[PDB]
Design an enzyme around this catalytic site. Structure first.
Site, PDB file in Angstrom:
ATOM      1  N   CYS A  14       4.036  -0.946  -9.241  1.00 38.02           N
ATOM      2  CA  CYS A  14       3.855  -0.372  -7.906  1.00 38.02           C
ATOM      3  C   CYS A  14       3.796  -1.429  -6.839  1.00 38.02           C
ATOM      4  O   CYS A  14       3.305  -2.544  -7.081  1.00 38.02           O
ATOM      5  CB  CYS A  14       2.653   0.549  -7.844  1.00 38.02           C
ATOM      6  SG  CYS A  14       2.769   1.930  -8.996  1.00 38.02           S
TER       7      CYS A  14
ATOM      8  N   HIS B  13      -2.902   3.348  -3.529  1.00 41.16           N
ATOM      9  CA  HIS B  13      -3.633   3.576  -4.782  1.00 41.16           C
ATOM     10  C   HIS B  13      -4.129   2.255  -5.410  1.00 41.16           C
ATOM     11  O   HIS B  13      -4.825   2.313  -6.415  1.00 41.16           O
ATOM     12  CB  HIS B  13      -2.874   4.468  -5.777  1.00 41.16           C
ATOM     13  CG  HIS B  13      -1.639   3.873  -6.345  1.00 41.16           C
ATOM     14  ND1 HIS B  13      -0.395   4.421  -6.086  1.00 41.16           N
ATOM     15  CD2 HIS B  13      -1.489   2.819  -7.177  1.00 41.16           C
ATOM     16  CE1 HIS B  13       0.472   3.664  -6.745  1.00 41.16           C
ATOM     17  NE2 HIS B  13      -0.143   2.695  -7.421  1.00 41.16           N
TER      18      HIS B  13
ATOM     19  N   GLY C 181       1.811  -1.372 -13.133  1.00 43.39           N
ATOM     20  CA  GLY C 181       1.757  -2.687 -12.519  1.00 43.39           C
ATOM     21  C   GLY C 181       2.954  -2.943 -11.603  1.00 43.39           C
ATOM     22  O   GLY C 181       2.908  -3.849 -10.776  1.00 43.39           O
TER      23      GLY C 181
END
Ligand SMILES: CNCC[C@H](C(=O)Nc1cccnc1)c1ccccc1
Ligand SMILES: CNCC[C@H](C(=O)Nc1cccnc1)c1ccccc1
Lengths: 304, 304
Positions: free
Chosen positions: B145, B41, B143
């Site tokens: 991830c 993503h 942030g």
């Protein structure tokens, strides 16, 4: 979202851990620049611990008696000195992995991370609070002495604790990096009274703000209190008295959530008087006091 | 003595953290050898997350669109590929700090440490359990991830988790290092059901043994139970059913303390039926399930 008892990343401290051996005793040392710091009881046998005369014991030791090994490499000891309860072993090589660092004396109620080590090798990392009575409720076995406590501010490690002792009660005692004990403790195998401990009120309040931020709100109520009224409750429940300085440090959390500090004190007062009624707050069934207001802001904002 | 929710030392993992930026989206990547792994993503805008067609989105991207920065140095991307929900960015330089590592798919109920990161920089480390419903109750903000979960066996890091998502309920979801989600989750901004969770019985038992080892014994009783009888209680209280395989893994703790596994099950049964009566076990007012039997043995023996 979510709130965890988070420790600082231990990497910069792992790079400083060494093994120090003197005679048949082994513990951990902290190698910063060309000095290795370790508890002075490395020079004792288990027998000597009953009432050690450290000055006399250290006089029988020479530089070559301190064996310092950083993983697999051996450090050459060119000087030794005792400062309070720590030994400083000057080595001929500066640690290439030395981070930017400071030695700090933390206040009771402040938190720090511990890198638990055995034989100079790191085993794990956990977040501790220095109790108001200067003890720490850590996780240490024989051989863990010399493991250190620290905080990190971007690239600077502030070392605040070095582990020395486990009291007969299972709580832990140690020194700052200049070898001064936190609390009334002495490095001797004797039963030693730890003062009456209290719950760190400002930290519980900070954690109640973290709960509100992260979704746990059931404990909020329609009440308020005063510093005087709250302190009567804090007295009955063995909490540290709240001061305006504590209210001031909670300022940013009060501003972010819009919950006045004294309104949060009233929620804490009701929780003290009524318990949790079988409910939880941030996964805990008790009032947590190992998160400072700075810790809460750091974690809630993602400070690296 | 003392027992803490201990995380592995994060140093070997800190050396692998990088920042990955694609367009206006930034997250963390894991640099091992000449490959950087990150959640796919990273290629989406906040808008794309409602129902992303990742194959189409990735087709509009070229190697030069993935900006990978390890602290202050820039990595040259020479290839990209999507494997399940992760992207693999081949770089022209192998990470000099690559530790010995493995990619593992952990089982629910197993534990691991998380190194929470933002912009490629580590912020903290904490110990998690993978819930029986495949979610983790972590501490992650936007942030984070690309932050990973891991275990360490001497010099080998076994990476088991990469963070991808926060469900509307505030719990966390992610993948193994091959990009396969743990649980039924998809990397899409949609409400997603997490299955019914249960308390990890074997871990609670392991933690009860850790309590006995470290001094907390008040919960021991004169009773015993059977797997069948205990499982009726486990059913009522939403605990995972205990099997002989669980009893077998508790073998070493049962041997060390001399408390038969079914006798410990009877203590757990009484604690489930009566609560703690306002007392604590290892500083907790609830039954803790984030310590496996291996974790207990490791910490109680000082494994590094
Ligand atoms: C001569 N070596 C003795 C070390 C021993 C020590 O490290 N013990 C200890 C045990 C558990 C956790 N933490 C620490 C010691 C230290 C201070 C006073 C008495 C005994
Ligand atoms: C395009 N970037 C969106 C990232 C965003 C994300 O990282 N969110 C998030 C928030 C808090 C903790 N952990 C994760 C996301 C990921 C998956 C599905 C929906 C939204």
């Amino acid at each position: 979202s979510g709130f965890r008892k988070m420790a600082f990343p231990s990497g910069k401290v792992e790079g400083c851990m060494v093994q120090v051996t003197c005679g048949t005793t082994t513990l951990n040392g902290l190698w910063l620049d060309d000095v290795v710091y370790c508890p002075r009881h490395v020079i004792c046998t288990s027998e000597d611990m009953l009432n050690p005369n450290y000055e006399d014991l250290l006089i029988r030791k020479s530089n070559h008696n301190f064996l310092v090994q950083a993983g697999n490499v051996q450090l050459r000891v060119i000087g030794h000195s005792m400062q309070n309860c720590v030994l400083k072993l000057k080595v001929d090589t500066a640690n290439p992995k030395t981070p930017k660092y400071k030695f700090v004396r933390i206040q009771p109620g402040q938190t720090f991370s511990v890198l638990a080590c055995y034989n100079g090798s790191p085993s794990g990392v956990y977040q501790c609070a220095m109790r108001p009575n200067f003890t720490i409720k850590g996780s240490f076995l024989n051989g863990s002495c010399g493991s250190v406590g620290f905080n990190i501010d971007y690239d600077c490690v502030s070392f605040c604790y070095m582990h020395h002792m486990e009291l007969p009660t299972g709580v832990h005692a140690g020194t700052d990096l200049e070898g001064n004990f936190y609390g009334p403790f002495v490095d001797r195998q004797t039963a030693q009274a730890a003062g009456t401990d209290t719950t760190i009120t400002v930290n519980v309040l900070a954690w109640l703000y973290a709960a509100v931020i992260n979704g746990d709100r059931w404990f909020l109520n329609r009440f308020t209190t005063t510093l005087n009224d709250f302190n009567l409750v804090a007295m009955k429940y063995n909490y540290e008295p709240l001061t305006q300085d504590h209210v001031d440090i909670l300022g940013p959390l009060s501003a972010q959530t819009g919950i006045a500090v004294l309104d949060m004190c009233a929620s804490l007062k009701e929780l003290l008087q009524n318990g949790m009624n079988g409910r939880t707050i941030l996964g805990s069934a008790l009032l947590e006091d190992e998160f400072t207001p700075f810790d809460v802001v750091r974690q809630c904002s993602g400070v690296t």
